[PDB]
């Protein structure tokens, strides 16, 4: 059984970073080489694991988190980072054990008039916990008066759009990100690459 990595990386549309999507991977053989072999991954930084010796160990579960951000925000998809993405949209823990994968998708997620399909959270009362998701559409109260559910003075809609256009600079062009989390709980292994679990035969 091959792990459905094609469904995650080759998706027609990705999720907004504020509502980042997670696909749990379990009970399959993971051809990690197929990853690095198919798209030109502009960023491929692994934390706590080794990309050269990937498909040699096992894991209880593997989580694939995918979303879209601009180019200059890919640096926020890393442990101990700050910014609108790391604080309000997608936060990685300090002891992150996994890989962060990102590639430019200007040909897919940009249009001449502006692709307002992808959003991000601009305001929030507090920072996000690691792997926390906030999809609420509550009007952010910046002042000391209630907003009554509509935007106004010191009352802003919390989500903002990118409006990707193909003529933007590389720092403002869309980038599709895939975050691979590797979990190892007190359970037998379920996701292994080419490891010595051929013994199942």
């Amino acid at each position: 059984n091959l792990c459905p990595f094609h469904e995650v990386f080759n998706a027609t549309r990705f999720a907004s970073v504020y509502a980042w999507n997670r696909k749990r991977i379990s009970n399959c053989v993971a051809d990690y080489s197929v990853l690095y072999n198919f798209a030109p991954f502009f960023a491929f930084k692994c934390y706590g694991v080794s990309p050269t010796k990937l498909n040699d160990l096992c894991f209880t579960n593997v989580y694939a988190d995918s979303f879209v951000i601009r180019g200059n925000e890919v640096s926020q998809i890393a442990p101990g980072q700050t910014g609108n993405i790391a604080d309000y949209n997608y936060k990685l823990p300090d002891d992150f054990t996994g890989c962060v994968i990102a590639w430019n998708s200007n040909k897919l997620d940009s249009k001449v008039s502006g692709n307002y399909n992808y959003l991000y959270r601009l305001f929030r009362k507090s920072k996000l916990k690691p792997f926390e998701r906030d999809i609420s559409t509550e009007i952010y109260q910046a002042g000391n008066k209630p907003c009554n559910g509509v935007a106004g003075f010191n009352c802003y809609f919390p989500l903002q759009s990118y409006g990707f256009r193909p003529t933007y600079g590389v720092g403002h062009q869309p980038y599709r990100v895939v975050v691979l989390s590797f979990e190892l709980l007190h359970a037998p292994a379920t996701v292994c690459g080419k490891k010595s679990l051929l013994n199942d035969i």
């Binding site: 502006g114 601009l122 305001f123 910046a142 002042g143 010191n154 903002q160 759009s161 409006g163 256009r165």
Partner: peptide
């Protein structure tokens, strides 16, 4: 929240909306 803090949030909302609308006008 103080007046200065409300203005920092107001200017924060302005920068993101202005950069989009200014780009539409400059491209046109």
């Amino acid at each position: 929240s103080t007046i200065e803090e409300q203005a920092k949030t107001f200017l924060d909302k302005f920068n993101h909306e202005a950069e989009d609308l200014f780009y539409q006008s400059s491209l046109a």
